[PDB]
Amino acid sequence: TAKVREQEIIRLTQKLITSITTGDYDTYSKLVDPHVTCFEPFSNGNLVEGLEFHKFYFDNTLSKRSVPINTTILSPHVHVLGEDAACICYMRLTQSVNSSGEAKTLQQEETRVWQKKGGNWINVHFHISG
Amino acid sequence: TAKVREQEIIRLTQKLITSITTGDYDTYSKLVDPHVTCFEPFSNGNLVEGLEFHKFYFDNTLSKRSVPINTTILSPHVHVLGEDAACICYMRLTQSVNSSGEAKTLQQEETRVWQKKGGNWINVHFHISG
Amino acid sequence: TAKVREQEIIRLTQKLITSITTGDYDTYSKLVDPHVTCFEPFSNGNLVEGLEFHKFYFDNTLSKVPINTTILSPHVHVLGEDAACICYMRLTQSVNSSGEAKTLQQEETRVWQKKGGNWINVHFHISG
Amino acid sequence: TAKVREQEIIRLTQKLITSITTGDYDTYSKLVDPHVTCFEPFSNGNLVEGLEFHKFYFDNTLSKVPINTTILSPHVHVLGEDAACICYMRLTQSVNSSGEAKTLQQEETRVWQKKGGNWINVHFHISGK
Amino acid sequence: TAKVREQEIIRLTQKLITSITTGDYDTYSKLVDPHVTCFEPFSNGNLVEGLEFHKFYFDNTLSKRSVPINTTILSPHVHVLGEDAACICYMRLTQSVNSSGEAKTLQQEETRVWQKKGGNWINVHFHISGK
Amino acid sequence: VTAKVREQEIIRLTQKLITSITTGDYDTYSKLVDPHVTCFEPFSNGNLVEGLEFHKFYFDNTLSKVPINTTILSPHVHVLGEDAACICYMRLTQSVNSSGEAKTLQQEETRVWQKKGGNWINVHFHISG
Amino acid sequence: TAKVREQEIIRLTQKLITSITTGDYDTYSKLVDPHVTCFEPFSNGNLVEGLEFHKFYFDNTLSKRSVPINTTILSPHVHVLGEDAACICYMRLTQSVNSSGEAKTLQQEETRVWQKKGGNWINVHFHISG
Amino acid sequence: TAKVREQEIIRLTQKLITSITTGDYDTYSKLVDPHVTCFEPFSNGNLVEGLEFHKFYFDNTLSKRSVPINTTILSPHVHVLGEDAACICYMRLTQSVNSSGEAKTLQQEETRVWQKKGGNWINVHFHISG
Amino acid sequence: VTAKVREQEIIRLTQKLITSITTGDYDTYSKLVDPHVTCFEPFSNGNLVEGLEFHKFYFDNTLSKVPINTTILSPHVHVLGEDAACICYMRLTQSVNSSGEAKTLQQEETRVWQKKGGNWINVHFHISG
Amino acid sequence: TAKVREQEIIRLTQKLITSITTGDYDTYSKLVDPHVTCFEPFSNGNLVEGLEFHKFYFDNTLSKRSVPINTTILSPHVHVLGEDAACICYMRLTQSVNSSGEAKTLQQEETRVWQKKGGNWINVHFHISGK
Amino acid sequence: TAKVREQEIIRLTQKLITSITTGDYDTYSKLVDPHVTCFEPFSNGNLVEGLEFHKFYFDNTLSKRSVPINTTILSPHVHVLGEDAACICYMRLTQSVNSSGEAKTLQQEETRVWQKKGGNWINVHFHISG
Amino acid sequence: TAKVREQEIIRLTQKLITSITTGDYDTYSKLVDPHVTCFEPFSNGNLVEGLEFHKFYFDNTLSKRSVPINTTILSPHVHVLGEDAACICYMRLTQSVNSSGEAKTLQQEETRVWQKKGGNWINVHFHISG
Amino acid sequence: TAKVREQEIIRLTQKLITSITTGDYDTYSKLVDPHVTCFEPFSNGNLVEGLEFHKFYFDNTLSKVPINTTILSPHVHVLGEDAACICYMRLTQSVNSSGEAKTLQQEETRVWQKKGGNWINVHFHISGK
Amino acid sequence: TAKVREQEIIRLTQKLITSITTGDYDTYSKLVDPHVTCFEPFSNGNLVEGLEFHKFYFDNTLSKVPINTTILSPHVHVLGEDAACICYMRLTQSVNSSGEAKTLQQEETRVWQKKGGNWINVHFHISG
């Protein structure tokens, strides 16, 4: 059944997004490939490879956010590409409130490619824009 | 072997990008799934599905010229996911010249997911950011 | 039957939006109530009533450029036998006669009511 | 009577707005469906679903300045026994620490459905000019 | 019988608004008092008196308009002050299109005081804001 | 010319009314302004609002809480009948901030008065500026 | 009587403003003292003396008028100073329409001092601003 | 004689300007008519009547003066209108220094109409601008 | 008070000099202004320039090539001696562009006159504005 | 003997400029006529008369300055008009530093008319521009 | 002798710069390696490989410049790296004049790496900034 | 073989970049020629020679911290010119976080020419652009 | 005589400036060294050498508006028999098609060397404030 | 001897520039003429004469931040036995006490004259 496999990718992507917002680099480093490639706003239009580029935010910005946030995932589409591969597409809304009573919402679009290596799904590439 | 698979994906992508810049929707529609999903600047942050969104450009803008353009593909990385699936990521430079001989270069980052369906490689999803 | 009703409202809505982009006021005036209420950017923050406010655009704008519309994440609330709500985002691709493309996005709520066995749009809310 | 039901929906909407402006989430969460859908400025052009998106503001800003709300030009569409839609403009008067007055205007559409004998708000659309 | 009087004030105002949009000064000058007082955006914050201030627009602006427009009257409230006096207030939406073809909507808020002088309803004072 | 006294009564009530506004005296204001008054004013954001609640909000949060001086210019009074009158005038408000810098604000005001039960009540007004 | 003299000063002023708008320098030069002083925006904060400074606009602007206008005199206040002197204070609204068809309104504040010299009323000083 | 009256109007004006700068409202209220009219920048293009509008600045600004100033009266011109009336026109330079120590100069143009009422000279109208 | 006539002569020459400037009459100007005149003026960019060449350039390229009116205000004349005088005044120049829009420009001028050979010559001047 | 008279006017002007920069009003008031006419940037385009206009700066600005400054006189030209009259013109550079420590240079152009009244040279008129 | 080799690199760089300013792609294509790498302002911060990226300007902008120009080469430093390799560094000033009488100067800094392949010096990499 | 030579250059460059970010001038001065030439943003478009220009940063800015930074090297291409010379070209991404937890990414493009002098590889020239 | 040589250099500089402003390259190229060095705004902060950089302007803009040049505060440093340096400010008056006047100021240093008995300008530095 | 003279002027010039960056007015006042003329940005387009104009900066600025100077493309015109001109660009690296570096560039001409057997700077021109 494929609908079961769509649910696992969604489950894993939720798990991955939770690890980013809570600064839990240990879960992140187990779900994302050590040779992950990516495009994202901080990569300044370059394809960057490796976890260290992202570990830098877990060390300095994600683990040190005092602000409360709420994340919403919109329109999750999962392409089951085979028995060992999948692609998930979704928009991500982050609500936040700063030192004042001033709230803001930010939107990102994300593509994440999951691959089954060993018997484990690992995110081998992602593209983020917003 | 792996290298040949990477070359096949790079060829398909080269031919896919060729059809776009040429305005050759006949080749585009054979390479891109009819239920393709995608993120691109013109989707305004939304995941749009289907070919009609892109066909709009083949019939009204990609048909148009005579501006000369040269396209350069940079740093293409191909993930071979399985026998039936692959992902390619690359940057795209477009050189152009407007009226009065002023040259500009534009850069796009692209993720294309490829899937073998019926023995044929089809682009089931892509993600573009400026 | 829950999904049948959803598809029926999505059909009517597609039909309505086509009538807007075509400039086909005959179809629009048959699907939209003569006493429709609405919020839209041109109403300038006011609730306006009646088709005339909208007929103005069919007569002086919409009947005059290629475009393509996309309806995103349509959700239909089935409200009973004779009522439904549909809400969606709408992307309008267009060109400026100079060869440049633009995409505009609007958010739409439309309330459908079955009056005399016919589905009519009695209220809609459009924002950007 | 149509007059009677129109008034019921207006009173449900006043009760709901009061719960929003006072930070009373228990009342809000009983009037708004757990799977509510909505468009509002903070949804950034998206259709968002569920209470959590709104509960975020009850927990982090709403339970905090004097204000007065006015409901302008309310129109209630009665849609059968168990459904109604109401649309109106909402004027919010407020004063900052500086004692400076300020009026904000929003336009709202709220779809109400009677579920389990209770009137629940299943979708709302909020915008500003 | 007050709802009778209200529908008459509304009809007169509609007739008045129509004479403005169409540039029919003959109908305007029969409905508006020759010594009408008014506040409006073109009066620059001043209470102006007399028709001559307004006739200036019928003879220059309100005539030369060939642009299509549609007028909507919103939230009309009529205060029936007595047998010989009434007051009406409303918002007025004006849609229009460019020669380029782009549309815009303008909003004004209008108060109009009507007095029965002789046997006719005359607009003796009006107030307009919003630009 | 028996009506010249009738225009002095309106002027006196209007001055009494504006006095109530600038001193924060809601009790006098509520006696002079109809409970179902309609109005346009800059703080209504272009909308016709009804009732005293909209205006009581300023008496409770801004007007009772800096030195000011108010001038009424070119007051014209229209006598419409035995039970109805209309007055229109411009209002200059001078003020000074904390820093000691002077400021003058101008508003145009139309006020409609109606005799109800032998008492002149302000049933509609329109303010711009 | 007091009100007749007010009416006279107002009449002279209306006559003077009419001469200004229609470019009629013959009437202006009979009503305005040859050694008139004045403050006006074109005097750049200076008190200017003589008719020549004003004749300049009659010969180059006021008579080259190619635009329709209407003038309104607001809240005229006359100070009857003596037998042979008066002062009038008023605001002047000028409505006009540009070449395209767009209307505008300008406001000026004016003080005019009138003196009866040789049995004839002459404007000996005026002060204009916006 | 003509020059003695000019000297008198100038003297009254200097006396009046001194009362303005030192916040001396007792002298101001004896020299300025209780029904004085005026145009000045704080009247927002309106002709305002009465002393109360001006008393406001004596009680809240002119008497709260905490800055040194010097006033110069430039090119005073007196029109002797009759026995009981005069008009004076002049420019007023006000030098001052801010809290830090930076000097500035402001210019105003003033017309003042004086009337002899009950044998005493009273300023019945004035027009100020910049 | 024999010197009051001496100040009228300076005034007459100055008016004659400014007349020569506005009419483009270099011949009169060159007779009234010293051949080794020194000056500050806005077109000298803050520098002291010497000689007539700098100013002849305007007579040849701008002043002889639009209607204008010139007003001289508050002319003060200083009589320094039998052979020397100084005059200072403000100058208002009104003009109108092609479009018909009016314009007024202000300049402050000091002019130093010296009797050389029984003839008053302008040996230094200073213009600002 | 004219070059003699020029060096004296230059010395007087240097004495005058020094009394300005140092805020010594006693020396200023002995060199500047009590009815001195002047044009300067603080006069806002007007010819002002009398010392009182300038004494205002000696008593507020030209005193309270503790900033270091250096003054340079450039291109001084002296017109010797006669025995009792002379004119001098020059550019004046003023350097100065902030409390922050940043330097700036300002330039003014100055004309000064000197008259021998009695047996003393008095500055009867001056013109300053450039700001 | 090395000073002779410095002169050949300078001679070749002059020859190369002449071919760019005159639009002579044929000389350019013989002096620059078909697998040349480069950084330059139009590469938008990317390393681009190949001649086609540059051929695009010869076809569209360099061969179609009507404007006259003068080139000046400042501070040419030549590093002789070996018998088959050299590096030359210099600043390049381009004077030009547009349709009007308006002249302008632009400055670029250039590094060019020359390699001896066969018996011919070819430019195998260049970096341009400005 | 070729690959080892490319690895040696990439190692030297890695060690060179390490010394810069660390502030370790002792290692920098051993890798960079004493007569090194260079173009960089801080040279304001000029070719500067010698180490003292760069030593200024080791003693006054690279010594400073405690801002965390991560550096990423992208697309390194190494030209092996001969036995005694090589050229490496790459892009450099620097992630950083200022006070208040705001992250920024900066990109630089770099050309470094390497020469074997006395059996030791020395960076004789480099070219940096932002 | 020092006065005599100072005058020679000033006249060489007037001749050179005249050749620049009239477009007379034959005269310029005989007064300016073929290996001249220079700083000027168009050199963009660089020391440029040779005539070609300047000949570019003779061929493409200079041979084209009335102008008057003034040399201000010339100072000549006599540096032995065969060398001198002169520094001065140059004011250029000009008029555009619109008949609008305009003054530009440059500061210049020119080093003159007697080579082959002829005075040649071997280096110049030009700036503007 | 042509190059010896060039190196002598480059030595003196380096020595002069060090005296500026050090705030060492004693050395500066020995290498620069008491009647030096100059153009520099602070002279505001004027030719100024004398050391006092420059002493102002030694007393209120230069004697108060780390910096490094670089002299670029120095060219010396040997003008005779007793005169030379040197022109060069000058880069001044500095920090703002907040940790940020800046580079400023100036273009300098300096005229050296041998008076009494000693080289003195009689004129200099500085622009940016």
Numbering used by the authors:
A (entry chain G), B (entry chain D), G (entry chain B), H (entry chain B), K (entry chain G), L (entry chain D): 342 to 471
C (entry chain C), N (entry chain C): 342 to 405, 408 to 471
D (entry chain A), M (entry chain A): 342 to 405, 408 to 472
E (entry chain E), J (entry chain E): 342 to 472
F (entry chain F), I (entry chain F): 341 to 405, 408 to 471
Quoted from the paper:
Ca2+/calmodulin-dependent protein kinase II (CaMKII) is a Ser/Thr kinase that is particularly important in neuronal signaling and cardiac function. Our data are consistent with the idea that the CaM-binding element induces the hub to transition from a closed-ring form to a ring-opened lock-washer configuration, which can release or capture dimer units.
The role of peptide docking in destabilizing the hub emerged from structures of the hubs of two CaMKII isoforms, denoted CaMKII-A and CaMKII-B, present in the sea anemone Nematostella vectensis. N. vectensis, a member of the phylum Cnidaria, is an early branching metazoan. The sequence identity between the hub domains in the two N. vectensis CaMKII isoforms is 62%, and these are 55% and 53% identical to the hub domain of human CaMKII-α respectively. The hub domain of CaMKII-A crystallized at pH 7, while that of CaMKII-B crystallized at pH 4.2. To illustrate this distortion from planarity, we aligned the pH 4.2 N. vectensis CaMKII-B hub structure onto the pH 7.0 CaMKII-A hub structure by superimposing the four subunits that are furthest from the break (E, F, G, and H).
